[PDB]
Short mmCIF file of all heavy atoms in Angstrom, two decimals:
data_model
loop_
_atom_site.label_atom_id
_atom_site.label_comp_id
_atom_site.label_asym_id
_atom_site.label_seq_id
_atom_site.Cartn_x
_atom_site.Cartn_y
_atom_site.Cartn_z
N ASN A 1 30.43 14.90 -11.39
CA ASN A 1 30.38 13.45 -11.59
C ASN A 1 29.00 13.06 -11.85
O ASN A 1 28.80 12.06 -12.63
CB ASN A 1 30.90 12.83 -10.26
CG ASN A 1 32.32 13.03 -10.03
OD1 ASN A 1 33.03 13.25 -11.01
ND2 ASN A 1 32.76 13.01 -8.76
N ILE A 2 27.89 13.57 -11.29
CA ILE A 2 26.59 13.03 -11.40
C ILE A 2 25.74 13.76 -12.28
O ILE A 2 25.09 13.20 -13.32
CB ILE A 2 25.89 12.84 -10.05
CG1 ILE A 2 26.69 11.88 -9.12
CG2 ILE A 2 24.51 12.42 -10.20
CD1 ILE A 2 27.11 10.61 -9.87
N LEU A 3 25.59 15.11 -12.11
CA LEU A 3 24.59 15.94 -12.84
C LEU A 3 25.06 16.18 -14.32
O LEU A 3 24.28 16.84 -15.02
CB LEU A 3 24.32 17.18 -12.09
CG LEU A 3 23.56 17.12 -10.70
CD1 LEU A 3 23.45 18.49 -10.11
CD2 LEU A 3 22.28 16.44 -10.94
N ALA A 4 26.16 15.88 -14.76
CA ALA A 4 26.66 16.23 -16.05
C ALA A 4 27.17 15.05 -16.76
O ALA A 4 27.92 14.19 -16.16
CB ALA A 4 27.70 17.41 -15.99
N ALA A 5 26.93 14.97 -18.08
CA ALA A 5 27.55 14.11 -19.02
C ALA A 5 29.12 14.39 -19.17
O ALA A 5 29.50 15.47 -18.93
CB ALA A 5 26.89 13.96 -20.22
N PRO A 6 29.95 13.36 -19.45
CA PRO A 6 31.30 13.67 -19.62
C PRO A 6 31.61 14.65 -20.74
O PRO A 6 32.76 15.33 -20.73
CB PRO A 6 31.96 12.20 -19.94
CG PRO A 6 31.08 11.29 -19.38
CD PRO A 6 29.66 11.95 -19.52
N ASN A 7 30.63 14.89 -21.78
CA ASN A 7 31.04 15.79 -22.86
C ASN A 7 30.50 17.19 -22.52
O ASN A 7 30.68 18.12 -23.29
CB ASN A 7 30.38 15.27 -24.11
CG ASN A 7 28.76 15.35 -24.01
OD1 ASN A 7 28.26 15.24 -22.87
ND2 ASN A 7 28.13 15.63 -25.12
N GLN A 8 29.99 17.38 -21.37
CA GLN A 8 29.42 18.72 -21.00
C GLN A 8 30.40 19.45 -20.07
O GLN A 8 30.76 18.95 -19.02
CB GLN A 8 28.09 18.56 -20.22
CG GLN A 8 26.92 18.18 -21.28
CD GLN A 8 25.68 17.80 -20.51
OE1 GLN A 8 25.71 16.98 -19.59
NE2 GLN A 8 24.56 18.34 -20.97
N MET A 9 30.68 20.71 -20.49
CA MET A 9 31.57 21.52 -19.65
C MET A 9 30.66 22.36 -18.64
O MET A 9 29.67 23.00 -19.13
CB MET A 9 32.35 22.56 -20.51
CG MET A 9 32.85 23.76 -19.82
SD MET A 9 34.53 24.25 -20.23
CE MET A 9 35.46 23.26 -19.18
N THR A 10 31.10 22.25 -17.48
CA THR A 10 30.07 22.86 -16.34
C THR A 10 30.91 24.00 -15.68
O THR A 10 32.10 24.02 -15.60
CB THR A 10 29.88 21.80 -15.34
OG1 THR A 10 30.91 21.79 -14.32
CG2 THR A 10 29.76 20.39 -15.99
N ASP A 11 29.95 24.89 -15.20
CA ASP A 11 30.41 25.97 -14.26
C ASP A 11 29.26 26.32 -13.35
O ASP A 11 28.11 26.18 -13.70
CB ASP A 11 30.98 27.26 -15.07
CG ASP A 11 29.90 27.76 -16.09
OD1 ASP A 11 28.84 28.17 -15.70
OD2 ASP A 11 30.26 27.63 -17.29
N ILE A 12 29.62 26.80 -12.26
CA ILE A 12 28.65 27.17 -11.12
C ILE A 12 28.76 28.68 -10.96
O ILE A 12 29.84 29.18 -10.68
CB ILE A 12 28.90 26.38 -9.85
CG1 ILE A 12 28.69 24.85 -10.04
CG2 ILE A 12 27.82 26.91 -8.81
CD1 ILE A 12 30.01 24.11 -10.06
N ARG A 13 27.59 29.39 -11.05
CA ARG A 13 27.66 30.78 -10.96
C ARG A 13 27.10 31.34 -9.71
O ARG A 13 27.27 32.50 -9.40
CB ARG A 13 26.70 31.36 -12.14
CG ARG A 13 26.96 30.69 -13.45
CD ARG A 13 25.94 31.08 -14.61
NE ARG A 13 26.52 31.04 -15.82
CZ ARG A 13 25.72 30.98 -16.95
NH1 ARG A 13 24.38 30.86 -16.91
NH2 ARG A 13 26.32 31.02 -18.18
N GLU A 14 26.34 30.56 -8.83
CA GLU A 14 25.79 31.12 -7.67
C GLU A 14 25.48 29.87 -6.75
O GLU A 14 24.84 28.85 -7.22
CB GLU A 14 24.48 31.85 -7.85
CG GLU A 14 24.14 32.77 -6.78
CD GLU A 14 23.21 33.99 -7.19
OE1 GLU A 14 23.84 34.96 -7.77
OE2 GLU A 14 21.99 33.89 -6.99
N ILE A 15 25.84 29.92 -5.48
CA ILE A 15 25.53 28.94 -4.45
C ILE A 15 24.97 29.60 -3.27
O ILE A 15 25.51 30.64 -2.76
CB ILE A 15 26.81 28.10 -4.04
CG1 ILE A 15 27.37 27.45 -5.31
CG2 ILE A 15 26.51 27.17 -3.04
CD1 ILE A 15 28.46 26.38 -4.93
N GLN A 16 23.81 29.08 -2.83
CA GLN A 16 23.12 29.68 -1.60
C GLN A 16 22.62 28.61 -0.74
O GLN A 16 22.39 27.44 -1.19
CB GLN A 16 21.92 30.50 -2.06
CG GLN A 16 22.18 31.74 -2.84
CD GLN A 16 21.02 32.74 -3.12
OE1 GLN A 16 20.09 32.65 -2.41
NE2 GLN A 16 21.26 33.65 -4.06
N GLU A 17 22.42 28.91 0.61
CA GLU A 17 21.90 27.97 1.63
C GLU A 17 20.81 28.64 2.29
O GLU A 17 20.86 29.88 2.63
CB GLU A 17 23.03 27.64 2.61
CG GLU A 17 22.36 26.99 3.90
CD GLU A 17 23.27 26.00 4.51
OE1 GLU A 17 24.53 26.08 4.50
OE2 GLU A 17 22.79 24.99 5.20
N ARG A 18 19.62 28.09 2.30
CA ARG A 18 18.41 28.66 2.99
C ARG A 18 18.10 27.69 4.11
O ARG A 18 18.38 26.40 4.08
CB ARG A 18 17.36 28.93 2.09
CG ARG A 18 17.12 28.00 1.00
CD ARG A 18 15.99 28.40 0.04
NE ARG A 18 14.74 28.15 0.63
CZ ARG A 18 14.02 27.04 0.24
NH1 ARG A 18 14.49 26.16 -0.42
NH2 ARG A 18 12.80 26.91 0.85
N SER A 19 17.45 28.11 5.22
CA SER A 19 17.03 27.22 6.25
C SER A 19 15.75 27.70 6.85
O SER A 19 15.62 28.85 7.17
CB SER A 19 18.25 27.34 7.38
OG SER A 19 18.25 28.65 7.90
N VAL A 20 14.79 26.71 6.87
CA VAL A 20 13.48 27.00 7.47
C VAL A 20 13.18 25.73 8.21
O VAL A 20 13.29 24.54 7.76
CB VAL A 20 12.35 27.35 6.43
CG1 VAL A 20 12.51 28.85 6.05
CG2 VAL A 20 12.51 26.50 5.16
N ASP A 21 12.46 25.92 9.44
CA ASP A 21 11.95 24.92 10.27
C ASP A 21 13.10 23.90 10.68
O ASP A 21 12.79 22.67 10.82
CB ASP A 21 10.76 24.12 9.68
CG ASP A 21 9.66 25.09 9.23
OD1 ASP A 21 9.96 26.20 8.93
OD2 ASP A 21 8.58 24.65 9.18
N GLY A 22 14.23 24.28 10.78
CA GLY A 22 15.39 23.51 11.13
C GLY A 22 16.07 22.71 9.92
O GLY A 22 16.84 21.87 10.09
N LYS A 23 15.45 22.89 8.68
CA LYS A 23 15.82 22.09 7.55
C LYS A 23 16.69 23.08 6.62
O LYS A 23 16.13 24.17 6.34
CB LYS A 23 14.60 21.52 6.83
CG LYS A 23 14.13 20.17 7.55
CD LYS A 23 12.88 19.68 7.00
CE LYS A 23 12.44 18.38 7.59
NZ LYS A 23 12.24 18.51 9.09
N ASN A 24 17.71 22.57 6.04
CA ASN A 24 18.56 23.32 5.09
C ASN A 24 18.37 22.86 3.77
O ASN A 24 18.32 21.69 3.48
CB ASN A 24 20.05 23.23 5.62
CG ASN A 24 20.19 23.57 7.14
OD1 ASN A 24 20.20 24.67 7.50
ND2 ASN A 24 20.23 22.56 7.90
N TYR A 25 18.41 23.80 2.84
CA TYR A 25 18.34 23.52 1.37
C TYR A 25 19.46 24.26 0.63
O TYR A 25 19.75 25.38 0.94
CB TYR A 25 16.94 24.00 0.87
CG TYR A 25 15.72 23.58 1.59
CD1 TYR A 25 15.33 24.37 2.64
CD2 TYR A 25 15.08 22.37 1.28
CE1 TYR A 25 14.19 23.91 3.30
CE2 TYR A 25 14.00 21.97 2.01
CZ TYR A 25 13.55 22.84 3.02
OH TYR A 25 12.47 22.40 3.77
N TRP A 26 20.11 23.50 -0.15
CA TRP A 26 21.29 24.11 -0.87
C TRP A 26 20.89 24.31 -2.33
O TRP A 26 20.67 23.33 -3.13
CB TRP A 26 22.45 23.07 -0.81
CG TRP A 26 23.23 23.09 0.47
CD1 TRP A 26 23.11 24.02 1.46
CD2 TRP A 26 24.16 22.10 0.86
NE1 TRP A 26 23.96 23.77 2.49
CE2 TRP A 26 24.69 22.55 2.15
CE3 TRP A 26 24.75 21.03 0.35
CZ2 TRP A 26 25.51 21.85 2.87
CZ3 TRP A 26 25.61 20.28 1.04
CH2 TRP A 26 26.09 20.74 2.17
N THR A 27 20.79 25.52 -2.77
CA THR A 27 20.31 26.00 -4.12
C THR A 27 21.48 26.41 -4.89
O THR A 27 22.09 27.48 -4.53
CB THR A 27 19.11 26.89 -3.99
OG1 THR A 27 18.07 26.37 -3.40
CG2 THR A 27 18.77 27.32 -5.56
#
């Protein structure tokens, strides 16, 4: 919805979660 224009076909190849100092990052 947000990161892609309507004409762009999208696919996700890798999803990871990391956590340091109690804070989580989704890469």
Side-chain angles (χ1 to χ4, degrees):
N1 290 335
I2 295 319
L3 290 180
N7 69 330
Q8 288 171 309
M9 161 141 272
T10 87
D11 53 64
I12 299 102
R13 320 170 146 155
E14 202 156 280
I15 300 192
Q16 295 190 17
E17 164 147 35
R18 39 186 278 270
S19 63
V20 279
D21 306 27
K23 280 172 176 66
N24 308 279
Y25 312 89
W26 283 347
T27 297

